[PDB]
Amino acid sequence: PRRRVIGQRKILPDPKFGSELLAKFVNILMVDGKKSTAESIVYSALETLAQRSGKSELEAFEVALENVRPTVEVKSRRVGGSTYQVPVEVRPVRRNALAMRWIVEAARKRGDKSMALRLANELSDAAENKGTAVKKREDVHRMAEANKAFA
Amino acid sequence: NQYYGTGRRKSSAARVFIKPGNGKIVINQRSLEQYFGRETARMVVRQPLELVDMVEKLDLYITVKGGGISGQAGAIRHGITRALMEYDESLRSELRKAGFVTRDARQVERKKVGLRKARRRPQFSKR
Amino acid sequence: RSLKKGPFIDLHLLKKVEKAVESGDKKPLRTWSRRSTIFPNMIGLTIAVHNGRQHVPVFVTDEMVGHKLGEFAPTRTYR
Amino acid sequence: ARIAGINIPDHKHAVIALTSIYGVGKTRSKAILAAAGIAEDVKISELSEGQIDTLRDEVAKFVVEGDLRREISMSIKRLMDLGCYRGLRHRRGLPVRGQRTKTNARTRKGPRKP
Amino acid sequence: RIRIRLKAFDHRLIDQATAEIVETAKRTGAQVRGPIPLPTRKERFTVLISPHVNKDARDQYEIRTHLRLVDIVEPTEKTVDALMRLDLAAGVDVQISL
Amino acid sequence: AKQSMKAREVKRVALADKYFAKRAELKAIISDVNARWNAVLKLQTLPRDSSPSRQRNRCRQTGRPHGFLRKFGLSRIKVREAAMRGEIPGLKKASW
Amino acid sequence: GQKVHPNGIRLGIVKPWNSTWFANTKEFADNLDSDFKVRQYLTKELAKASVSRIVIERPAKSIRVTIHTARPGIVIGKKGEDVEKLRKVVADIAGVPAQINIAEVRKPELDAKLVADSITSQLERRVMFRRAMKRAVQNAMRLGAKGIKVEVSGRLGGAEIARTEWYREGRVPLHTLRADIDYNTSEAHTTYGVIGVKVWIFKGEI
RNA sequence: GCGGUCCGGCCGGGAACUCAAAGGAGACUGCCAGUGAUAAACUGGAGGAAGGUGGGGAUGACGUCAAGUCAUCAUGGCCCUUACGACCAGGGCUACACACGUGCUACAAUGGCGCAUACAAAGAGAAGCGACCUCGCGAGAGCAAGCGGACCUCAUAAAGUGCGUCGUAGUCCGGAUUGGAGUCUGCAACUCGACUCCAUGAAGUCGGAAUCGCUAGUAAUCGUGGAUCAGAAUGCCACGGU
């Protein structure tokens, strides 16, 4: 992508609750393209998220997400042989977009005994924000802002 | 009177018959979920009915084979909508905004001579 | 495990395992059919096999009833 | 549940545990539980010393335990003493069954050094 | 009753030979079942073009097989007759057997 | 391509049928589940080259033991040699 | 070394096959080898005859063969003399009967294999190769023709350096499938190695 | 949509639909708007199955590297010539203290293994594919119908979906290896094949420096056929699921 600035591939909404954002995640979690077994651990790992948190359900995901949505970040550059890395705010769409990569990334490590569980304990670990994601929402808040003098 | 439309997608071609009866459906002589109507392709078939009314308004006899699941189902959704035109062209107008009319060009790319498969370029040493 | 049903040997060699039990077993044999097996009607025989260079001598002992006639004749030499 | 060999394999299902002995595999893990009036998904957590002492007298047919430790070893020395080829390898540290060796051949050699 | 699997390599020559067997059968005889296309067997062969090494080169070739069915329902002594002898057109294959 | 290596196949061909196959059929009903009498696997000392595999198939205009296709008979390079000039009927550059 | 054969690619269009027939795998090769076995010999016996193309067609267990040449006269003999002897042997290869065509070639100046051979002899006749190509092109444009280009390669006029001179004139759309382009090699052996002459002659539109 | 069913499109029957293969039509920034000279063009919209070379091939300019190929082959010169030629048998290339390269398989629960059962496209075939029944646990062997083939065989596709075992533990993972016991083609398989079957189970619990591929139905994951071929592909060529 040099002269040609593209756009975005708005993906099909959710096949049950009906939602975009919802979907993106479903894929984020998918691997090797097993979208079936994937969403088979999506809604199933979201069933107990409509029970323990209790807060409705359609938003039992959203609200918990707001705890992993940064507003500034980093980026490598190279000006004269150094790095002069200058932070920046994450685009409205890229913001929550990132949020999901991590929330799950915490499930990619949290070695329990069952994925669906290695998923909820963190999404719920967002209600009272204290998981490897909300705290991951700190490695950038701390990394960046420190070199904010260049912003 | 009988109603129909073809509709196909990625080697999965299907034939769809609308019969003013009930939401009930029988694709390839075997009830909905009695085939695949629950997998990823859940209410996928309903979709072409979302922006309209049914439930017990119109029955339908479906027929498809060749390819894969989500693929077949696609054609289904295609036929259904390009068969649902009969009531009028006025609905196909508001049914296009759901791009259900669009035939999916998407198709498997041929594996050229040189790559491991389509786009995958075999790794070469450092330099 | 290989030759389906029933072992295999030579003909220009069989006139030497059968002709070794009646005329007294003489000096080692010199053919080129390692492919043959070890029939109990050879036991003791002075067998040898040309493998690249010369013929390596061996003694058809006891319990060796179902094994080739070449494994005992390494052609590749190293060290 | 020592049974047959001194090995005390336990705390594992029927068709499961059983395959712990040297000479007991999947195949011969049902060929016995199907000729003694015993089930499969059964955990010894309810096995009377009676439905076992009968499963113990079964293994007594095909060479296992130490018997097999020197049973196959019997042919080990044999094939070697013969002075053939298939025996040469073992008494050397090289793959028997004709495998190549311009490179890989570690399973029958040993972790590289130089 | 009488099948006629006519096969060739050029599309506009296989159905220009059929365009005859028919205009003949529907002449000295009749019935016929119009021409029936039939699947096309395209057999490709991928080969290396460099006289030595250079695998990623290659020249992909292919030969196309076009079919015709004809299938005459009502034979004719006058039709099964002239049928033979006259045929012309070099390069096409004819098969009426059962 | 070594007139010699060429004739080696011609002798493996003229010897595979005038002998093997013709009498090589002496290993089917004969050498199978028929019962054993030694008459079987014994008179097995015919030619050698005469065999249904003792061959390599070689270009009819050169003799390159590799890249030889039956459908055309010739070898890849000699094939293309033709290809681009009609030479091989209904054969052209594929694409799709 | 990176250009496709003009003819062989146009095979799906403008330029037709040279071997028109059909067979089965079972005996496709035995036919192919059968076919291109007649060419080899028929060409030889007609060297000084100015040949340029030999079309073979097998009409079901049989054979026709159309011989092309701008020089047909002395390819037949005294009212059928020569052609006869040819057919004879011709048939005696495959195993089936034989007949043979006799196609003339009005204007050899534009035919590929002709202008290509019309030089391979020039070279072995120790003539100024840079005069052969200049010849060709000109008297090739002379009578019609839209495009024409000749190429030569190997020890030219004597050398230890392998050079390849070309020479175009007019207009030659080698990349336009629908353009009628006739191309033909033509090797010539001299006292010091082989030489290569590859011609290209553009003639028409659609 | 029609009638008869031993409910198998099985048999009348029907050309509609799928598909088959010939000839058409269509997309050209053509329309609207914006930016940009009122230009070209890019952005967005409409209609449209498809937009903005729709996707994918084929196609690779004058030329560069006295690149590679004189073992495809042809070829100037050179050399051998009762000979580095040539006939035969056996043996190496499948050897191996090793480093490197491209790979297949893993290191597991978004996964092993057991039962049940739902969907490919593409391709080949007669000195071939070889049902069905039948013998073995199985690889196979017997009887042999059909098919030079949208008619028959090769394939009942795999992931997948519904329960079931398991519990994150080198373990029910992973499969090297060694022995024993068997299958297939061949004159003949020990050095050297391919496959099944019974026991055995390392290393690896995901990888430093560094680095490779990929911007779409693509990467990854999943099976399928094919060329050569007597027989031996994780290789190559081609296909198609998610």
Residues 36-95 of B with CB under 8 A from A: 39-40, 42-44
CA dist G172 → A120, G146, G149, G151 (Å): 70, 8, 8, 14
Helices A20-29 & A92-105, crossing angle to 10 degrees? 40
Give the C-alpha separation, G9 to F85, whole Å. 9
Nearest to E9 among F80, F89, F95 (CB): F89
- The answer to whether residues B91 and B84 touch, using CB atoms and an 8 Å cutoff, is yes
Q: Find chains touching chain A: ≥3 CB pairs under 8 Å.
A: B
Closest residue by Cα to residue E64 from E4, E12, E5: E12
Six-digit token string for G175: 């990349």
Sequence-ordered alpha helix ranges (H) in B1-127: 47-50, 69-83, 89-94
C chain contacts of residue F41, beta-carbon cutoff 8 Å: 6, 8
Alpha helix stretches (DSSP H) within chain D: 14-17, 65-69, 71-82
* A135 close to A141: Cβ distance less than 8 angstroms: no
- Collect all residues with Cβ–Cβ distance below 8 Å to A20 and sequence separation of at least 6: A10, A11, A13, A14
Q: In what order do the strands lie in the sheet with G66-69?
A: G19-20, G51-57, G66-69, G101-103
Nucleotides of H under 7 A from a protein CB: 1, 17-23, 43-44, 47-51, 54-64, 66-70, 72-77, 85-104, 109-111, 118-121, 123-127, 141-142, 148-150, 157-162, 164-168, 172, 176-194, 197-202, 210-222, 227-231, 236-242
Best residue of B110, B113, B116, B124 to probe chain E, by most E CBs closer than 10 Å:
B113
Q: Which nucleotide is nearest to D73 (CA to C1')?
A: H179
CB of C30 under 7 A from strand H?
no
In this structure, is the CB of residue B9 within 7 Å of any atom belonging to strand H?
no
- G188, G121 Cβ separation under 8 angstroms: yes
Query: Looking at the complex, does the CB of residue G9 fall below 8 Å from at least one CB of chain F?
Result: yes
- F71 CB contact with strand H at below 7 Å: yes
Q: What CATH number has the domain spanning G16-106?
A: 3.30.300.20
- Residues of chain D found within 8 Å of residue C70, distances taken between Cβ atoms: 85
One DSSP character per residue, A7-48 reads --------SSS--HHHHHHHHHH--TT-HHHHHTTTSHHHHT
Chain G residues touching residue F63 (CB < 8 angstroms):
none
Distance CA A146, CA B10 (A): 52
Distance from CA of D103 to the nearest CA of C (A): 16
d(CA A123, CA A106): 10
Calpha distance C16→C47 (Å, rounded):
10
Across the interface, whether the CB atoms of C72 and D83 are under 8 A apart is answered: yes
Q: Which domain holds residue E80?
A: 1-98
D16 closest-nt by C1' vs CA: H172
Q: Which two tokens stand for residue D67?
A: 């018997």
Q: In angstroms, rounded to a whole number, what is the distance separating the alpha carbons of residues A39 and G64?
A: 68
Contact F80 E63 (CB under 8 A): no
CB contact under 8 A, D82 and C64: yes
Q: Where in chain G is the domain with CATH 3.30.300.20?
A: 16-106
G192 in reach of chain F (CB within 8 A): no
Q: Which residues in chain F touch residue G29, judged by CB atoms under 8 angstroms apart?
A: 60, 69-74
Is the separation of the CB atoms in A151 and A86 below 8 Å? yes
d(CA G74, CA G49): 7
Whether E91 sits inside 8 A of G20 (CB atoms) is yes
Residue by residue, what is the 3-state secondary structure of chain G? CCCCCHHHHHCCCCCCCCEECCCCHHHCHHHHHHHHHHHHHHHHCCHHHCEEEEEEECCCCCCCCEEEECCCHHHCCCCCHHHHHHHHHHHHHHCCCCCCEEECCCCCCCCHHHHHHHHHHHHHCCCCHHHHHHHHHHHHHCCCCCEEEEEEEECCCCCCCCEEEEEEEECCCCCCCCCEEEEECCCEEECCEEEEEEEEEEEECC
Q: Tell me the resolution in Å.
A: 3.1
Closest CA to C5 of D108, F32, D102: F32
Distance in angstroms, CA of E14 to C1' of H151? 21
**What CATH number does residue E27 fall under?**
3.30.70.600
Tell me which fold the domain G107-206 belongs to: Ribosomal protein S3 C-terminal domain (3.30.1140)
User: Rounded to a whole number, what is the distance in Å from the CA of F93 to chain G's nearest CA?
Assistant: 6
Please check whether residue E58 touches B, CB under 8 A. yes
CA G54 to chain F, closest CA, distance in angstroms equals 10
- Quote the CA–CA distance of B7 and A138 in Å, as a whole number: 51
Distance F72 CA to H83 C1' (A): 38
Q: In this structure, how many other beta carbons lie within 10 angstroms of the beta carbon of residue G165? A: 12
Phi, psi torsion values for G20, nearest 5 degrees: -105, 105
Question: C11–F44: do the CB atoms touch at under 8 Å?
Answer: yes
- Which residue, counting CA atoms, is nearest to the C1' of nucleotide H168? A113
From the list G204, G202, G186, the residue with the least C-alpha distance to G47 is: G186
For chains C and F, having 3+ Cβ pairs within 8 Å is answered yes
Q: Is B116 exposed, middle or buried (0-12, 13-18, 19+ CB in 10 A)?
A: exposed
According to CATH, where is 3.30.1140.32 located in chain G?
107-206
Quote the CA–CA distance of B74 and B10 in Å, as a whole number.
9
Q: Chain E contacts of F70, Cβ < 8 Å?
A: none
Query: Residue A138 has which token pair?
Result: 């700190």
Nucleotide nearest to F48 (CA to C1'): H187
Q: How many CB pairs under 8 A join B and E?
A: 5
* Partners of residue G32 in chain E, C-beta under 8 Å: none
Name the experimental technique.
Answer: X-ray
Please report the number of interchain residue pairs, chain C to chain F, with beta-carbon separation below 8 angstroms. Answer: 6
CA A36 – CA B39 distance, rounded (Å): 7
DSSP-assigned letters across all residues of F28-72:
SSTTSS----TTTTTS--S-SS-SSSS-----SSS--SSSB-TTT
Through-space distance between the first and last CA atoms of chain G, rounded to whole angstroms: 29
Q: Which residue is nearest to nucleotide H237 (CA to C1')?
A: E46
Q: How many structural domains are present in chain E?
A: 1
